[PDB]
Write a protein that binds this DNA or RNA. Structure first.
Lengths: 297, 141, 59
RNA sequence: GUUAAUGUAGCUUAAUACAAAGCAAAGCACUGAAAAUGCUUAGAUGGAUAUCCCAUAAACA
């Protein structure tokens, strides 16, 4: 058969390229049931509706999109964002968990509204002046995955709560007091992820308790993997929420006022200049040949 | 002061840090192949016999944001999976999923007939009003 | 110029006309298969009794 | 009744999970025809479980 449109060849060609082959190619080098029956009944009703048919032919139909979002929510798609941004590799050394509790967080700004914290969202450090609102007996931890200034694997806590009764977070132990974001300048977008871990039994995390207030980076540094490994028996993550933050004026305030340190500033480091090595005695070297080699020409 | 201690060079591990900054590498090869590969993300719109689907796909071929009328939430409020209005809704829904995913920029390369289709044009109108950009920023060298 | 009601009335009959034709096409396609299957089934029946008879028939 | 078939929509062991999917296929518009192209049309678990099951249809009968 011959493709009657370019797309037919393109779609097959695109699919063909994606699939691996024995010959070398670029990619290898560089790379419940009851509910459905109820759903089917709605389809018949929706299709039968004469008004809906008229709207379709009149191209005037509309949708309550807000309902779609709630019904769509979500576990499988929520995992994609966390994995896509590299939370799992940095936070659990590659362990991947499907979030089952629809965790949602927002940074409270003033009193009129609270800034959402989507998956992959961008929130300025200024807007994060105060701690955010997070919505059985579980725990909850805050992380600065790439906000660390000295060690790559290490990361800093904003605030860590343990033994959170049911859902109410006010009763959780404030092991780590809240700290505003402090992303270094020149490093682009820093990803901060919010993790919710199922707590099988209430356990005193004396090891993770930190002085309140604490303004030392030497004690804020920690590792999620080893911390989770120590509690991995009773800890199974289920909630995810992470945003990106750039440098901002508030960051200077955080680094100086309470962190009490000079603001970190970074940029791509260029290689040392390349210098040709001329010969001390240019034996049998004319000026015309040296003229091309030297700057003058 | 202990806090002052900082490494000479930063350690940023965010995959999209370079992409968001614009310094991430875009495929500049494939000079003998069409179309250009100088896009971090692409909008893939698949119109099946009974369903219309739109996706946002990275160069690697893995969809990050997927919007399909096959999804239960959209269809229940959507009369017919194949329709001009459905293209608008999936674009707005795809945008909302893009809003959920944090992806603001994308590269759309419609085919000659696909571009001429009014439904796809309205779907593009759905994306622009939702703020999703059909054109990505240029790479930084 | 046709009125919107006239177009709506005409829009309905085209749907009825399309529905009738598609039903006819589906029935027609099944008729082709049923007769072909019966004709192919007919071929097998006599072959069992005497293959020699078809030798003239197949010509 | 014994053997044996046959029980998602032309096709598929697509699927029983987050969807009853993908594919074949249709009407109208566009006037050599066809194709391409735009807008649109009709649809299924006759049924279970991790073999029974009834329906159906055969050789035994």
């Amino acid at each position: 058969e011959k493709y009657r449109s370019f797309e037919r060849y393109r779609r097959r060609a695109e699919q063909e390229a994606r699939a691996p082959h024995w010959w070398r190619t670029y990619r290898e080098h560089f790379v419940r049931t009851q509910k459905l029956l109820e759903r089917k009944h709605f389809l018949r009703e929706l299709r039968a509706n004469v008004e809906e048919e008229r709207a379709a032919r009149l191209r005037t139909a509309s949708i309550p999109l807000e309902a779609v979002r709630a019904e769509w929510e979500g576990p499988y798609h929520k995992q994609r964002l966390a994995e896509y941004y590299g939370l799992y590799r940095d936070l659990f050394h590659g362990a991947t968990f499907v979030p089952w509790v629809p965790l949602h967080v927002a940074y409270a700004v003033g009193e009129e509204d609270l800034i959402p914290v989507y998956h992959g969202n961008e929130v300025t450090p200024t807007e994060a002046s105060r701690a955010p609102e997070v919505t059985s007996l579980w725990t909850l931890l805050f992380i600065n995955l790439d906000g660390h200034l000295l060690e790559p694997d290490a990361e800093y806590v904003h605030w860590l709560l343990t033994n959170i009764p049911s859902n109410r977070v006010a009763e959780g132990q404030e092991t780590c007091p809240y700290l505003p974001p402090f992303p270094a300048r020149g490093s682009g977008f820093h990803r901060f992820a919010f993790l919710l871990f199922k707590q099988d039994k209430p356990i005193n995390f004396s090891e993770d308790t930190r002085p309140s207030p604490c303004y030392q980076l030497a004690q804020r540094t920690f590792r999620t993997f080893d911390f989770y490994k120590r509690h991995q028996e009773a800890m199974t993550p289920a909630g995810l929420a992470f945003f990106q933050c750039r440098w901002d004026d508030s960051v200077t305030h955080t680094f100086h006022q309470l962190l009490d340190m000079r603001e970190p500033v970074f940029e791509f480091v260029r290689p040392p200049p390349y210098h040709p090595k001329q010969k001390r005695f240019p034996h049998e070297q004319p000026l015309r040949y040296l003229d091309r080699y030297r700057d003058s020409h | 002061k202990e806090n002052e201690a900082v490494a000479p060079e930063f350690t940023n591990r965010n995959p999209r840090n370079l992409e968001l900054l614009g310094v991430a590498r875009k495929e500049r090869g494939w000079a003998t192949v069409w179309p250009n590969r100088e896009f971090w993300h692409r909008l893939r719109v698949v119109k099946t016999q009974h369903h219309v689907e739109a996706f946002v796909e990275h160069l690697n071929g893995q969809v990050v944001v997927s919007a399909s009328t096959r999804e239960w939430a959209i269809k229940k409020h959507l009369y017919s999976t194949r329709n001009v209005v459905a293209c608008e809704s999936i674009g707005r829904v795809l945008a909302q999923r893009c809003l959920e995913a944090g992806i603001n920029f994308m590269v759309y390369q419609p085919t000659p007939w696909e571009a001429s289709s009014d439904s796809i044009k309205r779907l593009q109108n759905a994306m622009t009003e939702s703020g999703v950009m059909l054109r990505e920023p240029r790479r930084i060298y | 110029e046709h009125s919107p009601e006239e177009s709506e009335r005409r829009a309905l009959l085209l749907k009825r006309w399309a529905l009738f034709k598609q039903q006819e096409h589906e029935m027609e396609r099944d008729a082709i298969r049923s007769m072909l299957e019966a004709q192919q089934e007919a071929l097998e029946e006599l072959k069992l009794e005497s293959a020699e008879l078809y030798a003239e028939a197949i010509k």
